[PDB]
Design a protein around this ligand. Sequence first.
Ligand code: HEM
Ligand SMILES: *[C@@H]1O[C@H](CO)[C@@H](O[C@@H]2O[C@H](CO)[C@@H](O)[C@H](O)[C@H]2NC(C)=O)[C@H](O)[C@H]1NC(C)=O
Ligand SMILES: *[C@@H]1O[C@H](CO)[C@@H](O)[C@H](O)[C@H]1NC(C)=O
Ligand SMILES: *[C@@H]1O[C@H](CO)[C@@H](O)[C@H](O)[C@H]1NC(C)=O
Ligand SMILES: *[C@@H]1O[C@H](CO)[C@@H](O)[C@H](O)[C@H]1NC(C)=O
Ligand SMILES: O=C(O)CCc1ccccc1
Ligand SMILES: [Ca+2]
Length: 595
Amino acid sequence: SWEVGCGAPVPLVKCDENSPYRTITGDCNNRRSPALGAANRALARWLPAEYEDGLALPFGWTQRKTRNGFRVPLAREVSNKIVGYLDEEGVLDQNRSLLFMQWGQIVDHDLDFAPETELGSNEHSKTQCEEYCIQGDNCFPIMFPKNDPKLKTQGKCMPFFRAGFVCPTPPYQSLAREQINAVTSFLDASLVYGSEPSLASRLRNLSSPLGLMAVNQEAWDHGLAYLPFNNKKPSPCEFINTTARVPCFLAGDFRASEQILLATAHTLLLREHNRLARELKKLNPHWNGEKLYQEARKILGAFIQIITFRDYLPIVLGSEMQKWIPPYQGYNNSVDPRISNVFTFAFRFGHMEVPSTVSRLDENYQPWGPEAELPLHTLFFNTWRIIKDGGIDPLVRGLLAKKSKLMNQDKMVTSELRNKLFQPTHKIHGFDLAAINLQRCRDHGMPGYNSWRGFCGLSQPKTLKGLQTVLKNKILAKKLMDLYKTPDNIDIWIGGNAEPMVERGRVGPLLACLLGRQFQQIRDGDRFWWENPGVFTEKQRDSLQKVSFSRLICDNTHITKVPLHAFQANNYPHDFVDCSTVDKLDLSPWASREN
Ligand code: HEM
Ligand SMILES: *[C@@H]1O[C@H](CO)[C@@H](O[C@@H]2O[C@H](CO)[C@@H](O)[C@H](O)[C@H]2NC(C)=O)[C@H](O)[C@H]1NC(C)=O
Ligand SMILES: *[C@@H]1O[C@H](CO)[C@@H](O)[C@H](O)[C@H]1NC(C)=O
Ligand SMILES: *[C@@H]1O[C@H](CO)[C@@H](O)[C@H](O)[C@H]1NC(C)=O
Ligand SMILES: *[C@@H]1O[C@H](CO)[C@@H](O)[C@H](O)[C@H]1NC(C)=O
Ligand SMILES: O=C(O)CCc1ccccc1
Ligand SMILES: [Ca+2]
């Protein structure tokens, strides 16, 4: 039936059998099909792509073409009528710290990226879309609905570009369009070390033979490292404040500076790597540069898997955790570890956990300075507020003592993100993440809300009343039914997120199913999972079993007062113990007698 496959834009896969370590590109993880779970390959399709013309065009591209008998609503109208809200009062999640939201975006970034197609440089094309809002080819501008306020102050549209696709880049005619995942499907720290060897190498400090990641030589943080700047122009970290002139950081993943707290968690990770390479040298002084780099890199990957799977996933999935992620039973080579396309949308539930402000806290966790609390939008691509305003320590305190936004059926995505997002290469703090998301679903040819309900063994509502019983909400159901004339057409993103939260979790049934399934594949089909026998020594695993974000903080900042359960709401000083009483990552198990 289907062809052996397509693969013009990839090199060959030459695999070293003996090698202990993972590749930067992900390749060679799975031996029977080595390209499974590797960067620059097409996202997996758990269900046939759904496209206007069943090839590449997205629904909503042709006025005349409908989906299931009806026209799909404009992404911004859905955004305005359903996703928005004015009152930031009473929306904080009482039992989740703001680190919960942050750890989410880190893991998502480690897992997937589908960057747009590059026609922009040395071409007017990118400004042709913005300026006259002409939909063509890649340019798929997000139009404003009639009653939109932005019509008056911004124009007729929000620029938008279709994501890049495999066997690229002018349209081809045979199979449906498949977008690219430009990072490795494996929870492997790709966001710290890179997914391309070309970048992986640059990021490294090769000068000395100590296997350290390269750091900033222009600025420090109390004798603590900063990520190196990325001296590429134009830079949005420079554009948001042309007086301070501070470039964006250079990390393993392209999007590290998008918001100051992501940039922050990125700074914590780099350090933990360096701190580890230094510790290893000391125990195994005879180790060469590469070994220190590799062994350290290996440890940090284990660290993220434990945190994400032991501490994070259970509080996201809760009651559904065990249903989809039963305890480890070992590597299975028949498990597809590739990230599926819809997961890159399911995982965006995190957008409703982002709150309107960010604070900096002093040593008694009190407002640090006159403008300690800041509006989120002034922080997109804001790098100067870290270097020219006291560094990470104060921001990492806010991550521990503040709360994440709770998902709310009447209060979904905060305006900081819904009206004021800043997108590089554009000039204004006036974009909508919600609209984008919806437009992206359409761009990826995503199947409707009910196909996914069907895919998960859940009911498939066909009427208003049907939808109300599923969402447990009359007015939400009424609004969706009005815009979408049938559930079958509700874009998965807004669909999955409209479902109420499963008890003890922070997502509904549909997302618990889609997320749960992906993460289980991510663990089970990974030849290098930290717990998979033979990857680490029996003793090393026991050592790793004690890791904690608290510990990661204590070891890489001068914060000496942390909670024990970093992801839950914790107030100071009651829920805050001294760092001394927190387990360490004793690295003794790594000694290597040469004799
Ligand atoms: C600003 C932005 C954030 C915080 C202030 C933010 C945050 C998150 C969290 C907390 C997530 C998970 C719990 C999460 C998931 C995904 N995001 Fe989102 N994000 C901010 C801004 C963006 C922008 C811009 C995009 C691009 C959207 C597009 O289609 O162009 C974005 C995406 C995603 C995304 C998809 C990744 C992929 O596979 O391409 C998540 C899975 N975020 N974000
Ligand atoms: C641009 O960055 C500069 C540099 O930090 C910010 O300027 C500082 O802000 C206050 C003054 O209100 C001072 O505490 C710093 O010393 C200032 N530095 C300088 C050189 O003025 C400025 O606030 C930022 N501008 C914007 C629009 O974000
Ligand atoms: C590389 O390592 C050496 C030795 O630790 C250090 O002095 C130097 O600053 C580092 N260079 C970079 C760019 O990190
Ligand atoms: C391995 O994966 C295949 C396909 O997902 C599955 O049928 C099989 O049950 C798995 N092996 C184990 C031990 O579960
Ligand atoms: C808070 O969350 C933790 C998990 O992080 C849970 O064990 C605890 O019971 C929760 N508290 C409440 C009031 O639900
Ligand atoms: O281009 C960037 O670096 C920011 C774009 C971005 C950032 C974080 C998540 C998705 C997209
Ligand atoms: Ca990865």
